[PDB]
Amino acid sequence: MFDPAEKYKMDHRRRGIALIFNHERFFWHLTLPERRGTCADRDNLTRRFSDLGFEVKCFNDLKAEELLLKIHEVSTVSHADADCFVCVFLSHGEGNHIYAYDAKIEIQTLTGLFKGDKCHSLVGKPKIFIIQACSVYTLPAGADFLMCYSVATVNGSWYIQDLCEMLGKYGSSLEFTELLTLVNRKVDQRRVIGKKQVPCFASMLTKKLHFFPK
Amino acid sequence: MFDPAEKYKMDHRRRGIALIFNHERFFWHLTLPERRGTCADRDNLTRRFSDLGFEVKCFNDLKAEELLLKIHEVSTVSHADADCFVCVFLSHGEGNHIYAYDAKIEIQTLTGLFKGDKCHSLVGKPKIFIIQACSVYTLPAGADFLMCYSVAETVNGSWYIQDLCEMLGKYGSSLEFTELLTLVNRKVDQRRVDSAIGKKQVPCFASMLTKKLHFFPKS
């Protein structure tokens, strides 16, 4: 017995936490340019994920310690009565690293916290990570992981604007990878096509993912 | 005007070439173990992609030169009357490298040949690469690229290919391709009974696709 149309069980009490790390300015000695319009991206995502029923928790220009303290805190909270988990990073990113205010951090250090072993209450539930960071990327940490990459302007970046537009229009009906595929096309249209690098998503998901209204 | 249900145009004369590089034995001084049952995987994929209408071209234990000559040859052929392109690598793989018989080759060197600039007759058409090679992977080369990874952790073949081919045989001619690939992720996840599932690394796919992809029978 095997069902091709089988969806994730999305009928828990809460949808889950939408965690957002927004980085605009950086420690001087890192020599990293200010990221104009990330607050626009952050507000845009908050809006969209809230209408999808997420509990959006925002954090601005956190230092490496404070960031690590918060994700671990979130990973050790009970998600038993939650559908899924969403984490977003809006910063600079070199290779397999994301940048905090003062230093860089390996992505798999962050995503590894939500693996089946460490985060039991999220086993079998979608774990979505969105990485908006300027050809390398780190492979999803395990089953039911979904990595979304921007693969990189005062109103925000193309990826987030186009993601949020689709999230706002189709988020509560379409299958999530369908919607993400649509973003790939929207960003491809900006080139005024289908010749250069667009946004990307790596899926270790095992079922269909929908965000039908609760 | 924007269509969420829009599919790739899959009504060209031919489906396209399914290119398979099967590596079983390796040059001695590479110190790489023989890959038992890759010929089983190779035969399995040939079977499946043929029923899907692909022109399957197989190459066994090719050396770095011969491999590079063939992919370039395939990339410079006209795909104007083709739906899409499929390339499969069955070998050992360290980081962003795949192994030929004698040496390793960067994946993006291979996939870069089918980018919009170099391969004009495949612009806007799906370019599917399947990598069966023992957490790093190289990002898809551009729009309409789809990378499929085994993420390996057995004489009839490997779990990934068996499970992929089973799904290809059962749902290949009807389901959307990423749907089907998602199903493979679940099938490989079930294998862990030696028990709790959905805890460890499963197979993966990175999609730069821009439309829905179906392999409906050509009539």
Curated annotation (Swiss-Prot), chain A:
Stored Gene3D superfamilies: 3.40.50.1460
Catalytic activity reads: Strict requirement for Asp at position P1 and has a preferred cleavage sequence of Val-Glu-His-Asp-|-
Location of the region described as 130's region in the Swiss-Prot/TrEMBL record = 96-113
Picking any one GO biological process from the record gives: proteolysis
The record's Gene Ontology cellular component field reads: cytoplasm; cytosol; nucleoplasm; nucleus
Q: Where in the cell is it found?
A: Cytoplasm; Nucleus
Domain remarks in the Swiss-Prot or TrEMBL record: The N-terminal disordered prodomain is required to prevent self-activation.
Q: Name one GO molecular function term.
A: cysteine-type endopeptidase activity
* Chain positions covered by the region annotation Tri-arginine exosite: 13-15
Query: Protein name, please?
Result: Caspase-6
S-palmitoyl cysteine lipid sites: 200
- What happens when you mutate residue 200 to S? Reduced palmitoylation, leading to increased cysteine protease activity
- The annotated active site, in chain numbering, is 92, 134
Coiled-coil boundaries:
none
| Database matches in Pfam families | Peptidase_C14
Q: Which gene encodes it?
A: CASP6
Query: Record's SUPFAM superfamilies?
Result: Caspase-like (SSF52129)
Q: How is it modified after translation?
A: Phosphorylated by NUAK1; phosphorylation inhibits self-activation.
Positions modified as Phosphoserine? 50, 188
Recite the UniProt keywords alphabetically.
Apoptosis, Autocatalytic cleavage, Cytoplasm, Hydrolase, Lipoprotein, Nucleus, Palmitate, Phosphoprotein, Protease, Thiol protease, Zymogen
Q: What does this protein do?
A: Cysteine protease that plays essential roles in programmed cell death, axonal degeneration, development and innate immunity. Acts as a non-canonical executioner caspase during apoptosis: localizes in the nucleus and cleaves the nuclear structural protein NUMA1 and lamin A/LMNA thereby inducing nuclear shrinkage and fragmentation. Lamin-A/LMNA cleavage is required for chromatin condensation and nuclear disassembly during apoptotic execution.
- Name the EC number(s): 3.4.22.59
From Swiss-Prot, chain B:
Q: Which UniProt keywords apply?
A: Apoptosis, Autocatalytic cleavage, Cytoplasm, Hydrolase, Lipoprotein, Nucleus, Palmitate, Phosphoprotein, Protease, Thiol protease, Zymogen
* Sites of Phosphoserine modification: 50, 189
Q: Which SMART domains does the record associate with it?
A: CASc (SM00115)
Characterize the regulation of its activity: During activation, the N-terminal disordered prodomain is removed by cleavage. Concomitantly, double cleavage gives rise to a large 18-kDa and a small 11-kDa subunit. The two large and two small subunits then assemble to form the active CASP6 complex. Can be cleaved and activated by different caspases, depending on the context. Cleaved and activated by caspase-8 (CASP8) and subsequently by caspase-3 (CASP3).
**Compartments where located:** Cytoplasm; Nucleus
- Where it mainly occurs, coarsely classed, is cytoplasm
- PROSITE patterns attached here? CASPASE_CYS (PS01122), CASPASE_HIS (PS01121), CASPASE_P10 (PS50207), CASPASE_P20 (PS50208)
Q: Does the record bear Protease in its keywords?
A: yes
Gene3D superfamilies named among the record's database cross-references: 3.40.50.1460
- Outcome of mutating residue 134 to A/S, per the record? Catalytically inactive active-site mutant
Q: Give the CC-aspect GO terms.
A: cytoplasm; cytosol; nucleoplasm; nucleus
GO MF term list: cysteine-type endopeptidase activity; cysteine-type peptidase activity; identical protein binding
Question: What residue spans carry the region label 130's region?
Answer: 96-113
* Post-translational modification (record): Phosphorylated by NUAK1; phosphorylation inhibits self-activation.
Q: What class of enzyme is it?
A: hydrolase
Regarding protein family, the annotation reads: Belongs to the peptidase C14A family.
Q: What is known of its domains?
A: The N-terminal disordered prodomain is required to prevent self-activation. The Tri-arginine exosite is required to recruit substrates for hydrolysis.
Which proteins does it associate with, and in what oligomeric form?
Heterotetramer that consists of two anti-parallel arranged heterodimers, each one formed by a 18 kDa (p18) and a 11 kDa (p11) subunits. Interacts with BIRC6/bruce. Interacts with RIPK3.
Q: What protein name applies here?
A: Caspase-6
Q: Which organism encodes this protein?
A: Homo sapiens (Human)
- Record lineage: Eukaryota, Metazoa, Chordata, Craniata, Vertebrata
